[PDB]
Enzyme design. Structure first.
Site, PDB file in Angstrom:
ATOM      1  N   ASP A  92      30.826  34.480  63.109  1.00 25.21           N
ATOM      2  CA  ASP A  92      30.058  34.881  61.920  1.00 25.21           C
ATOM      3  C   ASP A  92      28.548  34.861  62.165  1.00 25.21           C
ATOM      4  OD1 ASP A  92      29.945  35.897  59.300  1.00 25.21           O
ATOM      5  OD2 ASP A  92      30.495  34.011  58.320  1.00 25.21           O
ATOM      6  N   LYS A 123      24.865  35.863  62.513  1.00 19.26           N
ATOM      7  CA  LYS A 123      23.954  36.920  62.113  1.00 19.26           C
ATOM      8  C   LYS A 123      22.797  36.230  61.410  1.00 19.26           C
ATOM      9  CE  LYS A 123      26.822  37.892  58.010  1.00 19.26           C
ATOM     10  NZ  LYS A 123      27.609  38.922  57.258  1.00 19.26           N
ATOM     11  N   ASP A 171      27.605  29.263  57.781  1.00 16.90           N
ATOM     12  CA  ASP A 171      28.918  29.684  57.300  1.00 16.90           C
ATOM     13  C   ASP A 171      29.980  29.357  58.331  1.00 16.90           C
ATOM     14  OD1 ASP A 171      27.376  30.987  55.207  1.00 16.90           O
ATOM     15  OD2 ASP A 171      29.210  32.182  54.835  1.00 16.90           O
ATOM     16  N   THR A 205      30.926  41.092  61.045  1.00 15.66           N
ATOM     17  CA  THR A 205      29.961  42.028  60.473  1.00 15.66           C
ATOM     18  C   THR A 205      29.771  43.217  61.413  1.00 15.66           C
ATOM     19  OG1 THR A 205      28.900  40.221  59.325  1.00 15.66           O
ATOM     20  CG2 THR A 205      27.548  42.157  59.623  1.00 15.66           C
TER      21      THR A 205
HETATM   22  O1  LIG Z   1      22.625  30.008  50.212  1.00 17.82           O
HETATM   23  S1  LIG Z   1      22.556  29.881  51.633  1.00 17.82           S
HETATM   24  O2  LIG Z   1      21.365  30.273  52.318  1.00 17.82           O
HETATM   25  C1  LIG Z   1      22.863  28.203  52.088  1.00 17.82           C
HETATM   26  C2  LIG Z   1      24.037  27.886  52.719  1.00 17.82           C
HETATM   27  C3  LIG Z   1      24.246  26.602  53.207  1.00 17.82           C
HETATM   28  C4  LIG Z   1      23.293  25.639  53.062  1.00 17.82           C
HETATM   29  C5  LIG Z   1      22.065  25.926  52.412  1.00 17.82           C
HETATM   30  C6  LIG Z   1      21.031  24.980  52.237  1.00 17.82           C
HETATM   31  N1  LIG Z   1      19.888  25.231  51.609  1.00 17.82           N
HETATM   32  C7  LIG Z   1      19.702  26.466  51.121  1.00 17.82           C
HETATM   33  C8  LIG Z   1      20.607  27.477  51.242  1.00 17.82           C
HETATM   34  C9  LIG Z   1      21.837  27.230  51.900  1.00 17.82           C
HETATM   35  N2  LIG Z   1      23.779  30.778  52.249  1.00 17.82           N
HETATM   36  C10 LIG Z   1      24.939  30.359  51.443  1.00 17.82           C
HETATM   37  C11 LIG Z   1      25.642  31.489  50.804  1.00 17.82           C
HETATM   38  C12 LIG Z   1      26.485  32.220  51.789  1.00 17.82           C
HETATM   39  N3  LIG Z   1      25.801  33.466  51.698  1.00 17.82           N
HETATM   40  C13 LIG Z   1      26.124  34.377  50.591  1.00 17.82           C
HETATM   41  C14 LIG Z   1      27.280  33.937  49.718  1.00 17.82           C
HETATM   42  C15 LIG Z   1      27.014  33.673  48.377  1.00 17.82           C
HETATM   43  C16 LIG Z   1      28.013  33.224  47.526  1.00 17.82           C
HETATM   44  C17 LIG Z   1      29.281  33.020  48.011  1.00 17.82           C
HETATM   45  C18 LIG Z   1      29.569  33.299  49.337  1.00 17.82           C
HETATM   46  C19 LIG Z   1      28.598  33.801  50.216  1.00 17.82           C
HETATM   47  B1  LIG Z   1      29.094  34.298  51.638  1.00 17.82           B
HETATM   48  O3  LIG Z   1      28.318  34.083  52.725  1.00 17.82           O
HETATM   49  O4  LIG Z   1      30.237  34.974  51.955  1.00 17.82           O
HETATM   50  C20 LIG Z   1      24.504  33.445  52.384  1.00 17.82           C
HETATM   51  C21 LIG Z   1      23.861  32.016  53.058  1.00 17.82           C
END
Ligand SMILES: O=S(=O)(c1cccc2cnccc12)N1CCCN(Cc2ccccc2B(O)O)CC1
EC number: 2.7.11.11
Lengths: 18, 343
Positions: free
Chosen positions: B159, B161, B177, B194
Site C-alpha cells: 500500500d 504511496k 495504512d 493503487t
Molecule cells: O488521516 S490520516 O492521515 C492518519 C492515519 C493514521 C494516523 C494519523 C495520525 N495523525 C494524523 C493523521 C493520521 N490517514 C488516515 C486515513 C486513511 N486515509 C483515508 C481514509 C479515510 C477514511 C477511511 C479510510 C481511509 B483509507 O485510507 O482507505 C488517508 C491517511
C-alpha cells in the site's frame, strides 16, 4: 513538459486503491 | 559495518519474537468512545472517517479512525480491517504510526493513533512540486528500513504511496495504512493496491511476493524526486500498459546514481529486481545513491530533517481538508458481531 501532461491527466489528486 | 549488520540480524530476531507475542494474543478494547473529545473530521472514506480527538484525562491529541461495521461487510473489507488492527497493535518500529487504543461498539470499529499534525506527504509533495534528491533519499531510507522490518516478519505491505505516509514534527515519516498488509511466506494473489504503484506481476495476475514492495519503492522515489509518478495516464488501463512495457523515462535532472537505482527497482522482471536478489535489501542499502546515508543514524532519528512542516500547535488541522461534520451513529443493537469478534 511531462509535468504539464501530469497536471493535465486528472490523476493529480489523492489516488484511491483499486 | 559487518558488526552493524550482525546487530541488524539480532535486532530483527528480537523484533520477530516480540511481534509474534502480540500477534498471537492481540490487545483488545483498551479504551472507549466516552474517553475522548471530538474536535474535527480529518478525512472520509467509503466505510468510515478519521477524526481528530483529544483524550479527556491525558489531553493528548489522537487521530481516531472510525469504521462502520455494516459498510466494511458490504464492501467486503472484513479481512483487511481485522488485519490492519492486528498488525498495528503488534508492530513496533520508528516509522510506523503508533496505535495507542482500539475498541468497538454496536456499530463501529475504532483505532486511535497518535496525532501527527504535519499530515500526509502527498499534500506537501503536491504543493512544493518535487523534492531534491537528498530530500527524497532521507524519506526513501526510512521506507527501506521499514520494509526490511516488515518483510522480516513475513509481512507484505502492498500500500505504499505518498497518500499513506505522514511527516511528523521532527520531519520523519510514519507509514499509516495496513489494511492491505498480509503475513505471507511465499506468493499471494489478491489484486489490490493503487494503479500508479502496482508492480507488473500484480497487473499480470500472476502470483507475486514481497518484491512488489521494492517496485513500489521505486515508484515512490521517482514521484518524490520528479514531482509526478513514472507511469501515469487518464485511465488506469493506460497506466498498466506503461508499467508492463519495461520502459521508463527519467527527468533530465535525475542523477546517474538515482537512474541506476530506479532501473533496478523498476525492474519489470521480479527475479532481477533489487530487494529480491541473493543479497536482499543490502543491494539497495549498498547502492551508490545511498552512499551518504547513515542507516543507523536514520533508524535512531539522529539525522536532521530537510523539511519540518510549520509547527502551528499540537491540535492544528491546517494540513487536512474541511469535511461536513456528522454524528457518529451507534445502534441500540449489535451489528456484525461475529465478523469482528477478534477485533
Ligand atoms: O488521516 S490520516 O492521515 C492518519 C492515519 C493514521 C494516523 C494519523 C495520525 N495523525 C494524523 C493523521 C493520521 N490517514 C488516515 C486515513 C486513511 N486515509 C483515508 C481514509 C479515510 C477514511 C477511511 C479510510 C481511509 B483509507 O485510507 O482507505 C488517508 C491517511
Amino acid at each position: 513538459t511531462t509535468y504539464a501532461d501530469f497536471i493535465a491527466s486528472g490523476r493529480t489528486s489523492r489516488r484511491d486503491a483499486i | 559495518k559487518g558488526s552493524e549488520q550482525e546487530s541488524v540480524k539480532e535486532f530483527l530476531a528480537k523484533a520477530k519474537e516480540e511481534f509474534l507475542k502480540k500477534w498471537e494474543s492481540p490487545s483488545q478494547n483498551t479504551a472507549q468512545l466516552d474517553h475522548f473529545d471530538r474536535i474535527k473530521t480529518l478525512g472520509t472514506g467509503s466505510f468510515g472517517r478519521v477524526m481528530l480527538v483529544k483524550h479527556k484525562e491525558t489531553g493528548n491529541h489522537y487521530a481516531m479512525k472510525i469504521l462502520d461495521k455494516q459498510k466494511v461487510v458490504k464492501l467486503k473489507q472484513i479481512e483487511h480491517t481485522l488485519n490492519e488492527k492486528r498488525i498495528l497493535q503488534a508492530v513496533n518500529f520508528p516509522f510506523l504510526v503508533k496505535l495507542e487504543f482500539s475498541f468497538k461498539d454496536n456499530s463501529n470499529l475504532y483505532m486511535v493513533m497518535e496525532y501527527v499534525p504535519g499530515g500526509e506527504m502527498f499534500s506537501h509533495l503536491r504543493r512544493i512540486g518535487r523534492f531534491s534528491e537528498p530530500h527524497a533519499r532521507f524519506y526513501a531510507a526510512q521506507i527501506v528500513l521499514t520494509f526490511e522490518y516488515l518483510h522480516s516478519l513475513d509481512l507484505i505491505y502492498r500500500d505504499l504511496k505518498p497518500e499513506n505516509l505522514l511527516i511528523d514534527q521532527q520531519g520523519y515519516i510514519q507509514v499509516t495504512d495496513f489494511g492491505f498488509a498480509k503475513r505471507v511466506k511465499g506468493r499471494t494473489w489478491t489484486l489490490c493496491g493503487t494503479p500508479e504503484y502496482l508492480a507488473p506481476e500484480i497487473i499480470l495476475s500472476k502470483g507475486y511476493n514481497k518484491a512488489v514492495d521494492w517496485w513500489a519503492l521505486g515508484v515512490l522515489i521517482y514521484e518524490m524526486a520528479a514531482g509526478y509518478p513514472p507511469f501515469f495516464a487518464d485511465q488506469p488501463i493506460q497506466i498498466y500498459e506503461k508499467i508492463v512495457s519495461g520502459k521508463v523515462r527519467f527527468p533530465s535532472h535525475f542523477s546517474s546514481d538515482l537512474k541506476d537505482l530506479l532501473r533496478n527497482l523498476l525492474q519489470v522482471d521480479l527475479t532481477k529486481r533489487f530487494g529480491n536478489l541473493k543479497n536482499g535489501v543490502n543491494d539497495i542499502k549498498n547502492h551508490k545513491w545511498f552512499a551518504t546515508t547513515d542507516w543507523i543514524a536514520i533508524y535512531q532519528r539522529k539525522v536532521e530533517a530537510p523539511f519540518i512542516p510549520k509547527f502551528k500547535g499540537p491540535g492544528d488541522t491546517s494540513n487536512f481538508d474541511d469535511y461536513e461534520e456528522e454524528e457518529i451513529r451507534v445502534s441500540i443493537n449489535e451489528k456484525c458481531g461475529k465478523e469482528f469478534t477478534e477485533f
